[PDB]
Design a protein around this ligand. Structure first.
Ligand code: CHL
Ligand code: CLA
Ligand code: CLA
Ligand code: CLA
Ligand code: CLA
Ligand code: CLA
Ligand code: CLA
Ligand code: CLA
Ligand code: XAT
Ligand code: BCR
Ligand code: PQN
Lengths: 154, 172, 146, 73, 94, 69, 206, 43, 80, 107
């Protein structure tokens, strides 16, 4: 109920959005037979919409006066599924990408012509490294403590 | 002679200073001039807090004032204290800025240097303890608005395993 | 000026145009000249002229006090050169601090111009952000193109 | 896209909680944070309780004027 | 009423006492340490500006510490300031 | 002197020249002109080219500094 | 030796002289040596805490399921309100005491001679904290029995320790996930598996 | 062939392989787990 | 017109002047390099500023260096 | 042309949000974008981007992520090529979306 936003499980305009989209998809449904592929696909999209709205209701999303879910990023424990848990889920993958790429560039750095390994990606080397970014939040922390994360100028 | 035995003591404080335990993890006292100013200010903060804490618990044990008009008492305070503080600022010898002696040292406690060093250690230890005690007073008055320090000690001694800091430090 | 010299400044905030004032006529007006009642005039949806008067007065006190800061021909005041050579942090984080900066600004007209345009642009955006929200002119909030 | 797919309920709408907090920190009761000026018990509200805050509150809460607009995603 | 003629003279005499007796040595120390407002390593008067010429005539006081008229203006500007601050903050019942 | 004056052929060297592309970057000395009249004898060979697609440049003795490795 | 999967040589930065090595470091975490030392102490402490955990869960659930004592489920065990003390006090007391323990362990790890030399007063006991080893402190306080008085030539004992502890950690992860998707105790899940093993497993949870 | 695999490991071929695999992953996730705005597990 | 300058980092490879389409440059003897020659710029009045000279100087940054300056009819390359 | 052709006949590509013609309005805005993005290339020059690239290459070399294939700003002729192709693609896809939605809607 924060920021003047009513939850979507007890919002009027949210249910109105639901009803309006369902009537829109049903207006496009009285043009085909109820057993053919178009009508079946339209009914599947209808159930998709209804479950979508009900899932946004049951997660405790906050729907404003416009009747759309307004995500809360401030750090409220009820709304960590909005930003903070998927934010950690992001940063874990993003640091995976960065860490496997960095360890790859460091792996090829001791090559005769390293640039050809950035064009012709050494798939065995990367694949042996591709899972080494699973542990990036600890390996990077140690490389920061040991001094191996940041390079020295010389 | 170390705040956490095992941590490497920095190079700039090693035990020689009166109250040296090697607690400079942020590296504030790196340069010597700031270090000297810091120990001066430390002694002054210490002496003010040690003047304060017996001016808190003694009114609370008997008076129960809870340690809680302007344009005259404020003026007399500023006049009486700015004079002393600037006259203190006008000294340039640092060991005499921390420990003037002379007209400030009657009773001859500063007559023997070894006992002078031991008493400087005593001053700084009791003073750090009193600074902690005053910060405790302030935060215990912030958390509990309308209670006294000795009142809080009675609250602890009543049921210590149920009335402690934990009630404020975690939400539960 | 009895209230001003006698210190009884509160006598200048006695009848602060008590909410029925028509801008340009004595109906619902008052006698105050300097107020801090804040908010907007109800007719104009603008700031009170007494608030602007007290405002410019207060910042006049501040600027007239601040303009007696820097050293001049009368023996007192600050030298900005030593203010800058004194603001060098021990620790070497900033390094040599603001040393030699008075000479590289005062000789450099482009540095003066850059700092001036910095401040001017920020306060111009401030003029915009505060004239749209806190209009200080009568009947400018209700007209919408200006 | 979510509008182009007729699904405006799927949009990324982040309510500006921090600017709304500053607004409620100045007397705007349109969010219900009740902090430092919308809370009557706040000492900041108690200090200027008799100086400017009546006019400033009936100004900032009045949704016709243009200071501290009701902001959204 | 705080007797607006008594508080103001009181605060002015207070500022002058705090100036001459309590800290003039600190103020004159900081004046001599900050020094003149030099440009390119020299005073403005030493750089060709005929109009600076720090007025030693106005500074030549025979008060035995050196409390010149400018320091009298300084301590007394602060005095009247604190006086009217007290008077105004005491006028309204806030 | 007729013996070498500069770094050894192969000594990885750092560049102190502020206007070069490889400033504060290591190199690899491939030659040192032993003529005691040229101004920039130290022929270095770096690993990554400059903007002109060149990996080598002459440097002076004072515009160069060998690393501890 | 036998290093955790045949057909792969162990990494050259760890081999032989370490508590239950077996050469499993495919993700290059013990590549740096001081990192490996820190991780060894981490592993030992983790495994010992996990062993105490598995004992304190299996024993309590043997008492619970059979019905010797009415102890709560491991899942719903933290919210037990004790009469003499409160959890709000217990967290703070744990913080204090385990801080005095773990910071001492740390300052020994970074400086082995510490906690026993000078001004390290713990009720006059500045001798039981000699350490003798990283991760294996010894002394009358920590090993009163002293089964392994020596510790370098105690590879059997340390190997038993680390193997039982790796297994206890894996069993603790079992307790974490097995009782978050089934919402019962470990012994309940076991006797559910030992009635119809081919019909009650992880994937028989629909 | 060694050179055919050398070409398959080239940056564009491997990029389109990687992004086709990735795109199939995200696509099948947004079909099996469509219309997702909030992470409800341990919410 | 333009101010062409040759600095002492020149190796005497004769590309600056073999690239220069307006005869601005010329190689002269010198004792600062293994080739014993350095470029000079006498005919800067004929310098258009095309910087083909310094697009062919193989040094750390440059040895030849063209400074754009007072543009006349011949530095602007006008047939009218 | 601005009123009766552009403004008016672009009332079926922008109002086509939630319709079957919604990819047309999507590419209307997108081709607008790609055209404008092209203006970053046609207007700018290589030297600024090489200096910026060398700054962020310092930021990479600080973390041992210096790529051997040296990051170079686009060649000048390449900046012009990228500009003209994004400009043409954007203007042309704008027009394509506008025409197709306009003429499919009122048909
Ligand atoms: C290690 C450790 C683990 C694995 C758990 C695990 C758990 N504790 Mg927990 N605790 C742990 C240390 C501590 N706990 C507590 C005090 C509590 C309380 C007071 C509560 C938990 C609860 C929980 C659950 C949170 C979901 C989960 C079973 C909650 C629970 O039992 O919900 C089922 C709960 O109310 N713990 C203290 C003191 C600890 C030290
Ligand atoms: C403001 C009071 C104050 C001041 C100025 C100092 C100053 C000093 N202390 Mg002391 N100390 C204090 C309070 C103070 N202390 C208190 C309260 C304790 C007990 C908690 C200690 C315990 C202590 C130990 C055990 C030791 C010192 C030491 C030192 C010296 C070196 C460290 C340094 O540079 O810190 C300079 C510190 C400051 C400039 C204060 C900055 C405060 C920051 C800005 C905010 C702190 C907020 C905090 C988290 C909450 C409160 C220096 C002379 C060492 C020494 O050699 O003694 C001579 C030493 O071994 N101090
Ligand atoms: C750290 C935990 C760990 C993990 C994840 C593995 C994982 C594996 N081991 Mg290893 N292993 C370990 C510890 C571990 N082992 C230890 C501590 C020992 C005792 C030294 C062994 C001894 C061992 C042998 C002897 C064999 C494996 C084999 C295997 C594979 C089983 C095939 C499979 O995926 O079945 C699902 C798999 C890669 C087998 C294998 O595939 O051989 C290559 C095999 O023969 N392991
Ligand atoms: C978190 C607890 C923990 C920690 C810190 C360690 C630490 C270590 N292990 Mg051990 N290990 C553990 C649990 C743990 N182990 C468990 C439960 C098993 C059984 C599955 C093993 C089985 C095992 C073998 C067989 C070997 C090691 C070895 C090592 C060492 C080198 C590898 C390394 O740097 O990894 C450091 C590890 C971490 C920092 C932990 C990363 C945790 C990730 C992020 C979570 C993944 C969990 C998920 C369920 C999978 C290092 C001292 C090697 C050894 O003893 O020789 C020196 C070796 O060959 N480990
Ligand atoms: C490690 C570890 C930890 C953190 C705990 C934690 C706990 N145990 Mg368990 N326990 C452990 C190991 C551990 N145990 C082992 C190894 C044994 C054997 C036991 C046997 C045991 C019994 C028999 C009981 C506990 C109980 C308790 C609770 C209260 C303990 C207390 O101080 O009062 C608490 C949840 C008590 C409990 O569940 O609350 C009534 C209880 O009756 N523990
Ligand atoms: C069952 C696993 C296991 C094993 C084989 C060991 C084995 C060892 N430990 Mg470890 N330890 C364990 C669990 C284990 N410990 C746990 C759970 C803790 C946490 C309390 C510790 C805490 C610990 C410390 C702090 C120290 C040891 C020490 C020792 C050594 C001598 C004591 C001994 O053999 O006791 C074996 C005991 C049993 C087999 C009885 C198990 C009963 C069950 C309920 C030996 C290497 C000492 C050492 O190495 O220093 C020289 C030492 O200082 N251990
Ligand atoms: C050595 C540790 C250990 C042991 C003995 C068991 C044993 C058991 N588990 Mg547990 N489990 C473990 C680790 C362990 N698990 C771990 C690490 C996880 C996290 C992935 C789980 C997650 C888990 C779930 C979610 C469930 C079980 C279940 C079960 C039971 C049926 C077997 C099954 O579903 O296979 C699961 C086996 C694995 C996931 C493989 C883990 C690694 C093996 C044990 C290492 C080899 C030794 C059985 C009592 C089920 C149950 O409740 O039975 C009624 C059930 O629903 N387990
Ligand atoms: C950067 C801005 C931005 C953001 C934040 C989003 C965000 C989102 N968009 Mg939008 N979108 C954008 C730009 C953006 N989009 C643009 C530019 C376009 C035009 C191309 C679109 C077009 C678009 C469409 C058409 C749709 C979305 C949808 C979505 C949602 C995707 C949820 C989903 O399926 O993920 C679920 C998660 C994954 C796919 C990732 C899985 C990762 C794997 C499994 C690895 C993780 C596991 C790993 C092993 C670690 C586990 C832990 C342990 C092992 C350590 C989400 C709200 C969809 C939706 O539902 O809208 C609400 C949708 O229908 N977007
Ligand atoms: C500490 C621990 C558990 C401790 C549990 C305790 C105290 C439980 C206490 C309680 O229950 C009781 C007793 C009583 C209850 O009433 C109350 C509570 C309080 C609830 C588990 C650790 C559990 C730790 C686990 C599961 C760690 C697993 C690590 C793995 C698998 C690592 C793998 C790798 O790192 C390597 C080895 C090498 C790399 O190269 C490759 C990869 C693959 C990355
Ligand atoms: C909580 C939150 C928030 C906020 C937050 C913040 C404010 C933060 C900050 C933060 C910060 C302030 C940070 C900083 C940082 C810095 C640095 C300096 C870093 C560095 C790093 C590195 C260097 C890394 C690297 C890597 C990795 C690890 C990954 C990949 C690879 C690489 C190599 C890249 C909010 C409310 C909004 C929302 C919710 C959430
Ligand atoms: C932006 C810009 C640049 C810089 C443009 C850069 C170099 C393009 C940005 C890098 C591209 C996108 C390559 C990076 C993607 C690689 C294929 C690496 C893959 C990494 C993942 C995405 C897979 C110029 O060089 C330029 C030159 C002349 C006039 C105008 C301009 C101009 O406007």
């Amino acid at each position: 109920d924060i920021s003047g936003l009513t939850p979507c499980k007890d919002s009027k305009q949210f249910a109105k959005r639901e009803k309006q989209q369902i009537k829109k998809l049903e207006s496009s449904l009285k043009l085909y037979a109820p057993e053919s592929a178009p009508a079946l696909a339209l009914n599947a999209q209808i159930e998709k919409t209804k479950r979508r709205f009900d899932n946004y209701g049951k997660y405790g999303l906050l729907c404003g006066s416009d009747g759309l879910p307004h995500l809360i990023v401030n750090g409220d424990q009820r709304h960590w599924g909005e930003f903070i848990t998927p934010g950690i889920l992001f940063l874990y993958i993003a640091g995976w990408i960065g860490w496997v790429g960095r360890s790859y560039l460091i792996a090829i750095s001791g090559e005769k012509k390293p640039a050809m390994k950035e064009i012709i990606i050494d798939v065995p080397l990367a694949s042996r490294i591709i899972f080494r970014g699973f542990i990036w939040p600890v390996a990077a922390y140690r490389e920061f403590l040991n001094g191996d994360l940041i390079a020295k100028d010389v | 002679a170390h705040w956490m035995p095992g941590e490497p003591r920095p190079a700039y404080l090693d035990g020689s200073a009166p109250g040296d335990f090697g607690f400079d993890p942020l590296g504030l006292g790196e340069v010597p001039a700031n270090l000297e100013r810091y120990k001066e200010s430390e002694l002054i903060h210490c002496r003010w807090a040690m003047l304060a804490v017996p001016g808190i618990l003694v009114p609370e044990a008997l008076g129960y004032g809870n340690w809680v008009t302007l344009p005259t008492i404020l003026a007399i305070e500023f006049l009486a204290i700015a004079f002393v503080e600037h006259q203190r600022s006008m000294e340039k010898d640092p060991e005499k800025k921390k420990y003037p002696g002379g007209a400030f040292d009657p009773l001859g406690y500063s007559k023997d240097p070894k006992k002078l060093e031991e008493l400087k250690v005593k001053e700084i230890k009791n003073g750090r303890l009193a600074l902690l005690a005053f910060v405790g007073f302030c935060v215990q008055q912030s958390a509990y608005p309308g209670t006294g320090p000795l009142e809080n000690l009675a609250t602890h001694l009543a049921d210590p395993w149920h009335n402690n800091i934990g009630d404020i430090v975690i939400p539960f | 000026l009895g209230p001003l010299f006698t210190g009884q400044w509160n006598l200048y905030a006695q009848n602060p145009d008590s909410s029925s004032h028509l801008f340009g006529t004595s109906q619902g007006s008052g006698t105050a000249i300097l107020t801090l009642l804040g908010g907007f005039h109800p007719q104009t949806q603008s700031l009170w002229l007494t608030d602007m008067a007290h405002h410019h007065l207060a910042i006049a006190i501040l600027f007239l006090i601040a303009g007696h800061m820097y050293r001049t021909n009368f023996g007192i005041g600050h030298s900005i050169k030593d203010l800058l050579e004194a603001h060098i942090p021990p620790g070497g984080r900033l390094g040599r601090g603001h040393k030699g900066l008075y000479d590289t600004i005062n000789n450099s007209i482009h540095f003066q111009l850059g700092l001036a345009l910095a401040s001017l642009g920020v306060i111009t955006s401030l003029v915009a952000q505060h004239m749209y929200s806190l209009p200080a002119y009568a009947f400018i909030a209700q007209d919408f193109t200006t | 896209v979510m509008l182009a797919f007729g699904t405006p309920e799927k949009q990324i709408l982040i309510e500006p909680i921090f600017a709304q907090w500053i607004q409620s920190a100045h007397g705007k009761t349109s969010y219900g944070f009740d902090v430092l000026l919308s809370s009557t018990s706040g000492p900041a509200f108690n200090a200027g309780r008799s100086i400017w805050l009546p006019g400033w509150l009936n100004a900032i809460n009045e949704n016709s004027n243009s200071l501290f607009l009701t902001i959204g995603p | 009423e705080l007797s607006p003629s008594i508080v103001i003279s009181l605060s002015t005499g207070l500022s002058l006492f705090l100036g001459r007796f309590v800290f003039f040595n600190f103020q004159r120390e900081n004046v001599a340490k900050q020094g003149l407002p030099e440009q390119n390593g020299k005073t403005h008067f030493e750089a060709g500006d005929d109009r600076a010429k720090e007025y030693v005539s106005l500074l030549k006081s025979n008060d035995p510490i050196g409390f010149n008229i400018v320091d009298v203006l300084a301590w007394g500007s602060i005095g009247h300031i604190v006086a009217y601050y007290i008077l105004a903050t005491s006028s309204n019942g806030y | 002197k007729p013996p070498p004056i500069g770094p050894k052929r192969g000594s990885k060297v750092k560049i102190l020249r502020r206007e070069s592309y490889w400033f504060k970057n290591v190199g690899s000395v491939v030659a040192v002109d032993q003529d005691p009249k040229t101004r920039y004898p130290v022929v270095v060979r770096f690993a990554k080219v400059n903007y002109a697609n060149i990996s080598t440049n002459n440097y002076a003795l004072d515009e160069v500094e060998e690393v501890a490795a | 030796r036998a290093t955790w999967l045949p057909g792969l040589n162990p990494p050259p930065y760890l081999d032989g002289n370490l508590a239950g090595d077996y050469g499993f470091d495919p993700l290059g975490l013990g590549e740096d040596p001081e990192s490996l030392k820190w991780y060894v102490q981490a592993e030992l402490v983790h495994s010992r805490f996990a062993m105490l955990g598995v004992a304190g869960i299996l024993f309590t659930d043997l008492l619970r399921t059979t019905g010797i004592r009415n102890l709560p489920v491991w899942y719903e065990a933290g919210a037990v309100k004790f009469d003499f003390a409160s959890t709000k006090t217990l967290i703070v007391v744990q913080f204090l005491l385990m801080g005095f323990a773990e910071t001492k362990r740390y300052m020994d790890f970074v400086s082995p001679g510490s906690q026993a030399k000078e001004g390290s007063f713990f009720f006059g006991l500045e001798a039981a904290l000699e350490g003798l080893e990283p991760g294996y402190p010894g002394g009358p306080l920590l090993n009163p029995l002293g089964l392994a008085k020596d510790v370098q030539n105690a590879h059997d004992w340390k190997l038993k320790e680390i193997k039982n502890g790796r297994l206890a950690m894996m069993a603790m992860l079992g307790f974490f996930v097995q009782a978050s998707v089934t919402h019962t105790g470990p012994i309940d899940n076991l006797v559910e598996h030992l009635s119809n093993p081919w019909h009650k497993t992880i994937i028989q949870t629909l | 062939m060694r050179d055919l695999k050398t070409y398959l490991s080239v940056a564009p071929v491997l990029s389109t392989l990687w992004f086709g695999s990735l795109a199939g992953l995200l696509i099948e996730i947004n079909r099996l787990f469509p219309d997702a705005l909030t992470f409800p597990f341990f919410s | 017109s333009h101010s062409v300058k040759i600095y002492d980092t020149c190796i005497g490879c004769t590309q600056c002047v073999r690239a220069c389409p307006t005869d601005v440059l010329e190689m002269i003897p010198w004792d600062g390099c293994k080739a014993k020659q350095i470029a000079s710029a006498p005919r800067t009045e004929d310098c258009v500023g095309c910087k083909r000279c310094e697009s062919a100087c193989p040094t750390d940054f440059l040895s030849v260096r063209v400074y754009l300056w007072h543009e006349t009819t011949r530095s602007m390359g006008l047939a009218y | 042309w601005l009123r009766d052709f552009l403004w008016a006949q672009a009332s079926q590509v922008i109002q086509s949000y939630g319709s079957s013609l919604s990819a047309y309005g999507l590419f209307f805005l997108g081709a607008h974008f790609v055209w404008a993005f092209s203006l970053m290339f046609l207007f700018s020059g290589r030297g600024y981007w090489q200096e910026l690239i060398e700054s962020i290459v310092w930021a990479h070399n600080k973390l041992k992520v210096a790529p051997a294939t040296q990051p170079r700003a686009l060649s000048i002729i390449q900046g012009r090529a990228v500009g003209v192709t994004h400009y043409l693609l954007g203007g042309i896809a704008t027009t394509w979306a506008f025409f197709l939605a306009r003429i499919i809607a009122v048909g």
